Curated annotation (Swiss-Prot):
Protein name: E3 ubiquitin-protein ligase TRIM21
Domain notes: The coiled-coil is necessary for the cytoplasmic localization. The RING-type zinc finger is necessary for ubiquitination and for the IRF3-driven interferon beta promoter activity. Interacts with SKP2 and CUL1 in a RING finger-independent manner. The RING-type zinc finger is necessary for ubiquitination of NMI.
Full-protein interval shown: 291 to 468 of 470
Stretches assigned to the B30.2/SPRY domain: 8-185
Family note: Belongs to the TRIM/RBCC family.
Amino acid sequence: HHHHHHMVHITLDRNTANSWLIISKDRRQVRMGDTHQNVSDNKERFSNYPMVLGAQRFSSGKMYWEVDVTQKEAWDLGVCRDSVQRKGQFSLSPENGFWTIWLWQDSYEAGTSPQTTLHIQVPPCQIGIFVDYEAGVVSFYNITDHGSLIYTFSECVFAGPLRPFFNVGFNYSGGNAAPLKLCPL
Ligand SMILES: O=C(COC(F)F)N1C[C@H]2CCC[C@H]2C1
């Protein structure tokens, strides 16, 4: 792909984080803590899952960023509407305002309803995410495999401002403690 020139500097929004997340000082890395991180509750925080949003809001244009997923067993990545549900249980789907892929139990899937199997020969250590607001496109790229396409959501109905979306996953296994990291431009 040739989307690298639309690179944007994403930072994480502490106020949206689940209360167990630890966001680095530079707001570029997030991981699961082993306990509540001693913050007050607020209506923005994802309550049920280890999720956080980027601070940036996008309503036009083309945007690209990269995320490091090295040695994680489980995670979700993509974009979502600014007005997604924060509290209780929900599925990741375009109907609920999410355009995402994930790793879970040694398989990669796109967050369609129902979910779509992905065909990845080279397990990615870094994922590129491209959004074309006007075209209604969200695409995912395998940076470890020379930028190969993973998945394209097209005919997207955003229906609002978009925010970068992250889920570090639970760590029931003890094998999923590693952070998500926003990679330098
Ligand atoms: O955004 C989409 C589909 O495009 C892309 F995601 F593949 N949508 C929005 C959802 C609400 C109506 C049915 C669902 C279709």
